[PDB]
Paper text:
To characterise structurally the FluA asymmetric replication complex, without interference from the competing symmetric dimer, we therefore used in the following analysis the monomeric FluPolA/H7N9-4M mutant, bearing the PA/E349K, PA/R490I, PB1/K577G and PB2/G74R mutations. To characterise structurally the FluA asymmetric replication complex we analysed complexes of apo-FluPolA/H7N9-4M with hANP32A by cryo-EM. Two distinct such structures were determined at 2.77 (CORE-ENDO(R)-1) and 2.54 (CORE-ENDO(R)-2) Å resolution respectively, differing in the degree of polymerase core opening.
ANP32 is required for both vRNA to cRNA and cRNA to vRNA replication. First, it stabilises the formation of the replication complex, an asymmetric FluPol dimer comprising a replicase, which is part of a parental RNP and synthesises the genome copy and an encapsidase, a newly synthesised apo-FluPol, which binds the 5’ end of the nascent RNA replicate to nucleate formation of a progeny RNP.
Author numbering:
A (entry chain C): 1 to 248, 689 to 740
B (entry chain B): 1 to 184, 205 to 227, 241 to 645, 653 to 672, 679 to 756
C (entry chain A): 1 to 63, 73 to 716
Write the structure that this text describes.
Amino acid sequence: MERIKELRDLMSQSRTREILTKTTVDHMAIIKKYTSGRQEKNPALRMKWMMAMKYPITADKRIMEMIPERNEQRQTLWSKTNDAGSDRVMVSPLAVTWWNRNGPTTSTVHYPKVYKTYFEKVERLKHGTFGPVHFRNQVKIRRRVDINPGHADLSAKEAQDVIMEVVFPNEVGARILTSESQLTITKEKKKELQDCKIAPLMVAYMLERELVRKTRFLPVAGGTSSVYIEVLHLTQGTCWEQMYTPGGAVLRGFLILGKENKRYGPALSINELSNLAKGEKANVLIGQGDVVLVMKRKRD
Amino acid sequence: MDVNPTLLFLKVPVQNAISTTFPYTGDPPYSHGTGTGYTMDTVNRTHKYSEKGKWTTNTETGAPQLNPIDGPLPEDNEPSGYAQTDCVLEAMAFLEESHPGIFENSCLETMEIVQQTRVDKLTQGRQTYDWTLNRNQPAATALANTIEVFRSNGLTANESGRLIDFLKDVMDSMDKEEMEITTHIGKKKQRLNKRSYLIRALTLNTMIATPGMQIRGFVYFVEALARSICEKLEQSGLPVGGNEKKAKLANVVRKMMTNSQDTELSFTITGDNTKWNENQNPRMFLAMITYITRNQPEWFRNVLSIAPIMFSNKMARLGKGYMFESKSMKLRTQVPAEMLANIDLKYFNKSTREKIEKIRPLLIDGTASLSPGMMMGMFNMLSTVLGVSILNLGQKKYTKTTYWWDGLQSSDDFALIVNAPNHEGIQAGVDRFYRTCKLVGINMSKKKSYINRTGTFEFTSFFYRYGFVANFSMELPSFGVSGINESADMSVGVTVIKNNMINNDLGPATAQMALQLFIKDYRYTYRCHRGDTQIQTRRAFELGKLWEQTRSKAGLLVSDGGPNLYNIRNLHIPEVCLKWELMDEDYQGRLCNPMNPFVSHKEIDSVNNAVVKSMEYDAVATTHSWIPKRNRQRGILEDEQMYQKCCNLFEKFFPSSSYRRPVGISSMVEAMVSRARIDARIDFESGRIKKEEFAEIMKICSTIEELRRQ
Amino acid sequence: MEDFVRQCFNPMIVELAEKAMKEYGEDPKIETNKFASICTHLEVCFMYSDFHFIDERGESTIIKHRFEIIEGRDRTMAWTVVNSICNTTGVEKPKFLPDLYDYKENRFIEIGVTRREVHIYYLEKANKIKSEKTHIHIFSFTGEEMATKADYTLDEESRARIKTRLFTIRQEMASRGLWDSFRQSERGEETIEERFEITGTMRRLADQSLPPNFSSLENFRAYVDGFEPNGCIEGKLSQMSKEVNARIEPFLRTTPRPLRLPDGPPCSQRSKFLLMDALKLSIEDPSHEGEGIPLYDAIKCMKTFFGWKEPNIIKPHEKGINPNYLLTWKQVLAELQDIKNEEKIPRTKNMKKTSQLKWALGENMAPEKVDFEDCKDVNDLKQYDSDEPEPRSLACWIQSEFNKACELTDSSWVELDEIGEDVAPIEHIASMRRNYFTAEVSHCRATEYIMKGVYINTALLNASCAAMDDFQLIPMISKCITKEGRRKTNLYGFIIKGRSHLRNDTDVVNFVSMEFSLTDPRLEPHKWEKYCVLEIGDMLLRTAVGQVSRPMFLYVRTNGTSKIKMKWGMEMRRCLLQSLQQIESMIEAESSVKEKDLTKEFFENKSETWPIGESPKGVEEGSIGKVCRTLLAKSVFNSLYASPQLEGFSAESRKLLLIVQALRDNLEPGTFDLEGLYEAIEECLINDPWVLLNASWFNSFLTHALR
Ligand SMILES: [Mg+2]
C-alpha cells in the first residue's frame, strides 16, 4: 500500500530514518511544530488578490473523476496542475458551484446530530418571545458566565476520553481498556454515530464543543443563565435593554502483562479484543502504537 | 460658509466626539518609520542618556559597556538612566510589604511553568534572528535550524522535549570553543570561534528589533514570572483585556475621589514615560529579579537571572546598510553596514556623519554594543512591576505627609491621582513621585503628560469623563473578509460584528451598517453576487444556473448566490444552520456531502479557529470549506520538510494524532510498522486484500525493521 | 506535578509520603520528583501486600496478612518489627532495611520501581544492597519486571495489576508533560533535585553584569539576600538637587497660542483622481449590447459627446515631457476608434507599447544597480537625497474641495445590500436610525468619491492580477441613480496600467491617469504642478441665457499604486461606518439622558443645530444632516489624504484638544512642557494640504472656544 511504501521511502534516507527511530511517540507532537512554511501577513489582501486568478482553490486528486473539465459555457473548472507541496489539483470557484448544483446528493441525517449545538441555538431563537425596549442608563456588572448551554459539564480530560472512545475506538490508551465501567454518554454517542461519513476530526471537534464547559468574563445587566448569554448582543446595549425570553462489545477490564510476547501470536487490534476467551492472554496494539500483552480481568 | 468639523467640539465634549480625532479606520497604507539610521540614532540616544556611567570592556566580546547604575543623581529634567540599586531594592521590599507573599507565590507558579514547558513553545514567536543563517527567519524554522546545528555540534539535551534542556544546551554551546555550520548548493562548511558565536548569540536584529533563539526561552520564563507578579496587582494594567480595564479605571477614580474628604483636593495626571526603554537598565532588572527570587532553589534563581544577564551584554545589528546614488551616470549601489566601520565619511550628510562618528567606537563585527537601555516589547511586564511598585510607594504610610498618590501603570502609559489638602500639597506629591521615578530610573514625558482635576483623564487610549469611559485602544476592526474561505469568512464576519456589539460599544444601527458593508465586500470578493443580479463575473453563469434550478431560493447560502438573512437577531447562529430548514433536499445533500473533494481539516488547533490573537468561529463543514492555494538559498536542513514529512504519514497510521497529542513508549517507526502489520493481517483475513499484496506488505515491513535495527 | 500526585494517589498514601519526606526535612512543594517517587514506591508496596492472606494450613489464600510491611513505618518501628521477625523466625539480620517480609517463604523481599531499564536497576541493587537471603523484585513503568531466579512470589494476577497501575501512571504523566522530568530525575537509586548551574562563559558574563561596586554574582546575591530597607529612598531624595522637579504651569485662557503653519509656496493636489474638478460623460440608461463591461460602457459614454477637437498643451508639466502625454491621449483616441470600427469590442483593451507610453509609465526608467566597490571613486556619488521636504503654505483650494465634498449631489451614490427582516423592536429602531442616516448621506459628494475610488481601485487590482505584463486601458467608471430612478453610468477618464509583476504588497505598479475636466488650470496653476493639462474639446453648458461654450480639458499625470494602496482604496466604504458610529453615539447619549428613543427628535427635528462651520458673520450651525455629511466628508478626505503627517498631527493635537476641554470644564488643567507639545504638533505640518487645513481648523476652534 502507498502508506507502507512511503514509510520505507522515508526510512531509506538517513536523516528521516534517524528522526523516526529516535523520536518517541510522546515527542511526535513536538516535531509537528517544526513547520517550514510561512504564515501570510494580511491574509485578506492575499485572498482579494487570489480571487482575481483563474484557479485559486486547491482540490484533491479524485475531483477529476467527478467534476468535468468544462461546463456548458466551456468555462474551465479545474486545471491539470498541482499545489506547492502535494498532488492537490488547482480548481476554481466555478467547480465549487458546479458541485453544489450538480454534484452527487447524499443523506444529511447525521448533520443535526453532529452539529446539535448549532441547531439547538436555532431552535432557541425560533421559539423565543420579545418584549419592549427600555431606554435608560445601563450599569452592567462584569462576571464570569457560561458560553455553551446544553453541555454535560464534562472535564476536558474526560471529554477527550469519551471522544477517543467514540470517534477513534481502536486507539484508546491503557487507561480506557483498564477501566471497569463505560460511561453511558459514550455508548449513546457510539450508537448515534454508527454510520457517519463526516470527517472524524470534525465529529471529535463538535463533540468536544458540546461536552466541555466554557466560561468568559462578560458584562451583564440582566439574566446570567447560559441561554441568556448567547443573545447578549441582542438583549443588552450601551443605553438600552431589550426584553427577550429564550425559547429553550464491552472492551473494558483488561490487565497488562508486560511487553509483546511473540509466543502468544501476532498483535491484535482493540476492536477485535471481544473475541477473546475468559482468561486468554493475547497481544494488542493499544494507544498510538504500543504492543502489550493483555488478559481479561478474571476474579474481579 | 467654510465647513469646520473641529467646531463640533464647541457643543459636543471632546471625549464624547473623540472618534472624529482618529484619522484612519484600519492600518494605514504606508507602514513606515524604521531604518538603519533609526537604529544608530537609538543606540546613540541610549548611550547619551547614561553617558556619565562607568565604561568597561567585556572580557569575552571585548565590547564597550556602560554601567549607569548607582551613578550620579540627575541635576536636570532630561532623561536619565542613573538608577540606584538601593532605591530599587527598597521599592521591591515595600511592594512585598504591601503585598506579603506575592513574590513567593509567583515564584512557585513560575517554577511549575518552567518544569512543565516544552521546546515547541519557541515556535510561537514572530520573525526571529537566525544566527545560523544570520538573518530573519520564521520562529519554527529558526528553532529547527538551531536544533540541527546543536546536534551537529554534539548538543542534544533539547531532544528531551523540555525547554529547560534546550536552555542547558544553549549554555553549553556558549561554552563551546568552536561551532560548525553546514549549509546544503550541495554542501558548505563554516567555522565560528567562541567570540564570534557569542556576538551572534548576543544580537538583536533591527527591522522593533528581534532576539535570536538563544534568549527566547529565558525571556519567556522571566515574562512568565512577571505575568504572575502582575496578575496579583490591582494597579497593573497588564495583561488584562478591554473589559477588565474600564473596571480598574472606574474603581481607582472612585477610590481616590469618594474617599476624599470635603476639604481634600484631588488631581489626576495622564502621563507618558518619555522613553521607558532607553533608560531601563538590565542591571536593574537583574537586581529586582534577585530580590523577587529570594529564598528559592538555586536552579530557579539562575534560570530567571540568565535573561537580564544576557541582555546586559546585548548587541544591535545596524540593518541593511546604505544606498548611494550618482547623478552624472545615474548609478546606484548598496553599501552593507558591515563595511560601514571601514569606510570614509564623504558620502554621508552632516547628520549621518555625526551618527556614524558617534557609533563607530561602539561597533564590533558590524554590531553596535548596547549595554544600557532596553527595547520595547521585551520586558514590558517587569517594567510594569517596577512602575506599580513606584505607584504603591505613594501610600500615606510611605509618604509620611498629607499628600498621597495612587493610580494605574500599563508598561509605558500611566494614570496618577494625587490627593492633598491644598494645591501646594498636590505640587509636592507630584514632585515626590517624579523624583522617586527618576531615582528608580523612570522618566515621565513632560510634553506628553498633563494634569487636571480628577474626573477626566486618559489611559492607553481609554478616555474617562465623569464616569463615561470610551474605549479607543483599538478602533473599528476590519469589517471585510478575513481570507480563510467562504464559510469561515462569513462566520468570522458575523461573529466579529456580534462581539463588537457585545463589548466595544457598537450600536445597533452601526452593527446593521457593518453587516451590510461586510456582505457587499464578501459578495464582491468571492464573486457570489445574488443569482438574479445581472453583474457579469466569471462565476455568474454557474450561480445563475444554480439559482434557476433551486426552488426555495431563501435556503441558498450567500456564497451560493442566496439572500442575506442575517440581522441583529441571529448574529450568533451559523449560516448553514440558520437556513437549514429552507434548503432544498438535493442542494442540502450536495452542499453537505462529506465525500466532496473540497472540504479539508488540519490539526484541531486550526479547526474552526483563525489567527489574527486567535478567535474561534462557528461553522458547518461544507463544500465551501476549501483551502486557498499556497504561495512561495542557504539552508541548514537538506530537506526542510523532513519533520512534516515524518509527522505526515503518522496521521495515516494513527488518525487520532490529528485530534489528540499521542503518547507512547516505542519509537515512531516501530509503532507505524506494528500498525501496518496488524492492518494488513486484518484486511487479508476479511478477504479484501490478496496473498500477493499481503506478502508484499509483510516484505516491506521486514526490510523497514531491518533498516531501523541497522 | 504536585497537583497530579495529590489528585492521583490515595490520600492515605499521600499522607504517608508526606510524613516520610518530612522525616528527612524535605519540602514536597519544592522537590516534587522525590515526592512522586516516594508515593509510587509506597503504592507499589501496598499493592504488593494488599489482597493476600494466610490460611489455617499455612498456604497462601487470596480473599493473617501474607506480607508484612516494613517501609511504611518510622525507622524505629521498622527496625523493631524486622528484629521481631528475625527473632521469632530466626532469619539472618538484613544489612539494609527491607521493604516487605514474606511469611509463606519466611524471607525479606525488596521492591524497586525503576524509570530506566530493569536490568540496570537490578544489577545496581544486587551490587549495592543484596547480600544474602534477600529477594529483589524490580518493576518498571513500561510493564517489564525482574526478580532473582525468575521466581516471582505473587500470582500473575497481582503482578498484572501492578504493571497496569505503573503503565497508567506513566501514560498520565506523559500526557501531562511530567514524565520527562520524572524519568530524568532518577540516578541509580535516588531522585535528585533539578540542577541548572552557571559556569564558564556564562559565569563571567554574570560577574560582568552587576552594579559598579560588585565583582561576583554570588556577592551581589548575598548583598540582596540580607538587604533591609533603611531610608535609602528618603536619603537619595534629600540628596538630589531641587532642579529635578515636575512643576505644574497653569493653563487657563492665555497660555495657548495659534499653531504655526509652515511658510513657503502654496501646496498642490496629490490625490489619485480629481475630486471637485471631475467632469463625467454620462449615459442615462445603459441598455446596449454587451452592457456592464467597463470598455463597452466607456465607448458608449464617449460616443455621447460630440465636439472633440485637435488636442494641444495648455498647462505643461514642468518636470515632464508634454508631447509624450499628448501622444498618449492621441493613442488612446486612436485605439478607441479602432475598436469602435472593428465591431468586435473585446472585454479588455491592451494598449500597444510605444515610446510615449513606455516613457510615461516609467517602464525601464530606473538607475541601474551596481556594486559599491565598482563605483566608489565617482566624484558625483552621494547618499540618496533624504533632506527636509520643502514646506508649503496652505492654499484655499483644499478648503473649497472640502466644502464641495460636504454638499448634496442631485443623485444617489450608494445601493447597500440587504439584511434579514426586522423582528425585535430594537431591530426596528436600528433600521429607522440607519435609514435616516442613509437618507442624509446617500446623495453626498463624499459618497461619490467613495464609489469612484472603490471602483477605480477594484479595476486596477483586477487588471494587475489578470494582465501582469500588458499596457491595459482601464476606464474610470461609476454607477448612479438619478432622482427619476434611472440608472446612469458616468465616465471620468482613463487609466493606462503598466507592468504589474507585483510580488510583495508594497512594490508599485505605475499607471497614467487622464481625466476629463471643465476647470481651467491657469486659474490655479500651483494646484496642478504634477499635472499636464491639454485642451481636448468643447462642451455646451445650459444657463439662463441659453447654451454657452466652455473648453473641455484633460488632466494627464503619472502615478503609482501598490497592492496595499489598492486595498486601502477599495475599502473606502468604512467611512460611512465611522460617520454613522459617531452620529449614533450622539443619539444614544441623548436617549440615555432622556430615557427614551430620540431618533425622530434628532433627524426629523430640523431645528436643533450643531456648530459645523465658520463665516465672516461668525460660527455657523447646521442640522443633523449637515453634521452627518461633514463627518462623512472628513472621513473620506482622511482616507484620500492619508500620510504619516496626518496621524502624527491627530495624535499630538488630541492632547491639546483634551487640555482645552478640561479648561472648559473648570477642572484647573495644568501642563509640564506645553511648549514641547506645541513643537511636537507643529513638527507634523510640512506640505500636506489636508494636514494644514486641519491645523487651520484647530486654530479657528481654539479662537472660538477660548472666548
Ligand atoms: Mg497616557
